[PDB]
Ligand binder design. Sequence first.
Ligand code: CA
Ligand code: CA
Ligand code: CA
Ligand code: CA
Lengths: 642, 642
Amino acid sequence: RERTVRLQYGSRVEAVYVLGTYLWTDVYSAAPAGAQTFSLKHSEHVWVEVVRDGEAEEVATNGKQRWLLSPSTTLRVTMSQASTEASSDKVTVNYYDEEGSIPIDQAGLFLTAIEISLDVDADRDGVVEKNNPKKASWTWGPEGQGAILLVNCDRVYSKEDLKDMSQMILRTKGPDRLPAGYEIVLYISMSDSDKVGVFYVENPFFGQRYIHILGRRKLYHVVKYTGGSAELLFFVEGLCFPDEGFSGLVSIHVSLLEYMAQDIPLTPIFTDTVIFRIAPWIMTPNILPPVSVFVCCMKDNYLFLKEVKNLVEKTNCELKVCFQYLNRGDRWIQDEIEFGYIEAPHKGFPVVLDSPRDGNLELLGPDFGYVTRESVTSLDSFGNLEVSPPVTVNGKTYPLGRILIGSSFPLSGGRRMTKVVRDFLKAQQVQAPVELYSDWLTVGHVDEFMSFVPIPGTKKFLLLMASTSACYKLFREKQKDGHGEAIMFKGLGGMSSKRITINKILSNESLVQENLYFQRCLDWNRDILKKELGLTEQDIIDLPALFKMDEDHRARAFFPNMVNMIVLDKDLGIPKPFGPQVEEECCLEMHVRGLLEPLGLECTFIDDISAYHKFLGEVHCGTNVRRKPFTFKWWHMVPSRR
Amino acid sequence: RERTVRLQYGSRVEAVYVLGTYLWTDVYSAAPAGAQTFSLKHSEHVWVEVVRDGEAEEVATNGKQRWLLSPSTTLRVTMSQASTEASSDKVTVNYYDEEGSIPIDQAGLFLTAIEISLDVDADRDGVVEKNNPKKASWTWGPEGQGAILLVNCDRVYSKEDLKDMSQMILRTKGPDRLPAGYEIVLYISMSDSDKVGVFYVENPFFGQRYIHILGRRKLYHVVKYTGGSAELLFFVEGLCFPDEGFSGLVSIHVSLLEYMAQDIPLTPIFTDTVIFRIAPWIMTPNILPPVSVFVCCMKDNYLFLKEVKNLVEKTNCELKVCFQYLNRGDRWIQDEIEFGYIEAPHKGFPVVLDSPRDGNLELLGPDFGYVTRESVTSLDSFGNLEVSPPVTVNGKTYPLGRILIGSSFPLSGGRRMTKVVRDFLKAQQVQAPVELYSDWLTVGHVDEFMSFVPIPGTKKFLLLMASTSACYKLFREKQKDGHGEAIMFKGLGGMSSKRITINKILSNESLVQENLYFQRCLDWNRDILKKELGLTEQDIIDLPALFKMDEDHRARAFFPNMVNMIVLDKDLGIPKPFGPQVEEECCLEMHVRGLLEPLGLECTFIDDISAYHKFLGEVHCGTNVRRKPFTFKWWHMVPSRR
Ligand SMILES: [Ca+2]
Ligand SMILES: [Ca+2]
Ligand SMILES: [Ca+2]
Ligand SMILES: [Ca+2]
């Protein structure tokens, strides 16, 4: 980078030279009137070229060479090493008139060269490299560069308290002191001041006590200069995730400022900039390895707890049991909590989004970052948020999968998840969200009709879809087989008086029509999923489901929805359906086993309803599985622009 | 695109088939219980494949082939031509039990195939092509595609009134009527409703009267279906330019909706989408061919008008003379008005931004689009907005040049152009704006210190920089030559009593110090310009300038700033400086001629100050030049992301 420094007519100029730049120097203006030629001398560590109308010739330290004074004849001044106390770095220009060979005047330039670099890990290996040429940009992809910041999700300090922030190092080299009238200042924009924070030890002689030097209300910080070869260590934190008005990119600047006079702004003679991108919140699909299983239920639902514990004992996962709270729904671990993660090259951890029904008054432990929402419909629940396995769709890869959100049709006037949450998910960009149609369901959650499972022993997966058509087919077969009187809800005492059998279901004409309609709703979703996930019919299994319609023409489960299941690799916790009993086995359980088991999936049916004696379409338990993050690094993705 | 359509157990299904899709059809659910196999028939224009667990075999119109009933054995149904009144398009499936070869039941599918495509000129040739496969995306560059919309800058209708909007055509083919329970609806999002408007003839039998069918408060419009091969013509307008919260992209959708029942939302069985990008506002640099020269001044400033007219008579440009108005500054044609343009593949025109001092109460004529701003400092003036010629900077090309905006230093607390205007310019993206430092000037306009000129007979250009050092050098030479008593401001009667000479200027110690400081300000700009425009010293010419400092330590012209000049190709209108007279010629005029003339630039000095009898640093005239747009199409640029 070329920088202008003029000799001053008659008077010596003193300047700081920053390594990585060079100077162009006008010698003509400082020339006395009537002067004709000029010569120059310079010190050992200053390189000087005379540049005549574009042609540059290197000049000796002490020559006698003379050049004609011209506005188009200038100097180029370069230094490759920082000054020390032993340095006298200078360039002296002598001027001559036409007559004599003795100088009639002289103009000098006294230089102090310093190295100044604001450094970050822009090559994303976890180590802060020296002056990465690309540190002022941020690019996506395997070949991409620029530094990554984590949001601080836990919320004078100590170095340990800052352990998980990003490092930024100001590296300098130079003599004992900056020349008079200079200072170094770290700063950020007003706009970025609510996106970041920066910590520094201001007075290291008195301890290491990190203080917050940049952030809300603090836009600049003067940093003390240390001579010799020195490094100042800063820790940097993101304050928020990308969102509707925020791309996720922030900038930090350091400038060498020159004091001009009182009341005059200081001049930024050198500025160095680093860019950070704040890491997005990422959701984990069912195909990722389970770590912990979280469940919530009432204390006395014993079968549920026993059966869930038994399932988990089949795996290497740990079980975490939570009960009900005053401010939360009965499903809250599923509906109010979503497990996701963030990752930076140096580190990462799990981050839970929390959206309490009644608001906060609780935690899954210290391992997790926690993010809590600052009217709402049931579509706002995280039961209405799913994420697919990695897919490729028409040649475009989605290595982190795609987020799925239930909605209504555009012209319907129906329910929709709040824009705030939709915009948040879209802004994360790496999961490229898709809206499905959940609004035909009373509760309105995508997890009521669909789920994903891995196919054991492969890298592949299946979409599982609720199907009313599959149920009616099955019930019609059993009836033809002479099982029409087979009763459902066996062992639920509060259903007994209804005496619901296969015959009674099949003869209900309005229920048939309602369920044909619900199948159309399911099929509309099937088509969007196949399109947006790149799936064919061989990727899909239908599980029997049945719904009753409410006054809004919306569906609620007739019997528990088996699609909403605990997926731990090969082992599946499946809600126990309480279907018609044939030869003393539930025909729904047997049908589902016949679909899944041949694929190597192991089915365990979990009874969450017996404790309540009946099923009205509501489930009083919830589960959520914490998973290992993707092996693919999010920063290696190349998302579409805008 | 694959779409799900199930046969209905026992009952015939009727469906609309949209060309460009195909159906997957479950035959298993409609099968009676206990049925074993199935066979099918179909009409001539329906293609049917039996797909067994992924293997597809095409089937004859009337065969006797039978297949085992299975959930994994389905049909794939395709049609390549739209139905007519002569069509009976159908597929019939017969079911058999184990015993006999006579069908025990049958399920049909009756189809009406229609073509539906919402078409735009996405290939950017000005003609609306049939169903461009890329019409749902918008990509930059020479190979890029997707349709372009112009903002309506002039603001029941007629086709002529819509002449300059973008065309969008809904093309359909099919029989006399849609089957019962279907309608076609054009729609946009609530968010886009203030970005666009769409016009349509609703009742063509009663005339061609275009009405506004989509836009503010109108999010959808039902369009009437016409049988046979038909086209509906829509005209589309943008309502606003890209800005801080708006990328410039909008979407328009058409859906075929199916009526389900009363109180049930209609089902979107087919949707087609087109994307538009609204064309950005683009500024014209001094190197583009002049068309018209606009000037403003007081009625009696005769020399100015005479000399400007004489200059323009040297060219093929036309002159437009405007006087002063109550609501505007004396420079308003320069300060309150900026000439720019917009372009779409079909058309383009000039578009003026207007920012009246006191607000609007005026027009350059009907050829122009007009855009007027909805506290402010002098940095908000368009005198503070410039644009460079096309440049390449470190390998990155800026084919439209880059916009330059004067500002203060980040930590200075100084003045800055309003964020609204800065955000607007940034959002246009194609001119990639750069902030300079103008705040050391009292008025604070970049046009006070810098300009661009083409180098005649080449594709190259020069940056012209005001230089105080150049002036002091020149004055010191003339003094040494014995011209120290040469007087400035000759012929300005109100300056005479000051008796300002070269000696008096050179002996003023504080003025010398002030101007050294201003030269530092100029040089700081020089360096930013060289960096951000990719310029070297051979691209720059310095013109002599001199300033006086005010109480804020800001500069105002001592003598008229010659850099702010009328550039018409080789011919330059240069403010007459009223410099010291040597041998009866202004030494400033002679110096500037000696710099410019050798390059083939022709200099004409224009006196805008004599009518006022003196110069206090303020100029009472303004000029602005309307230019031809760049030959390079903006949509061929590939801007950096974000
Ligand atoms: Ca690194
Ligand atoms: Ca969820
Ligand atoms: Ca076209
Ligand atoms: Ca301007």
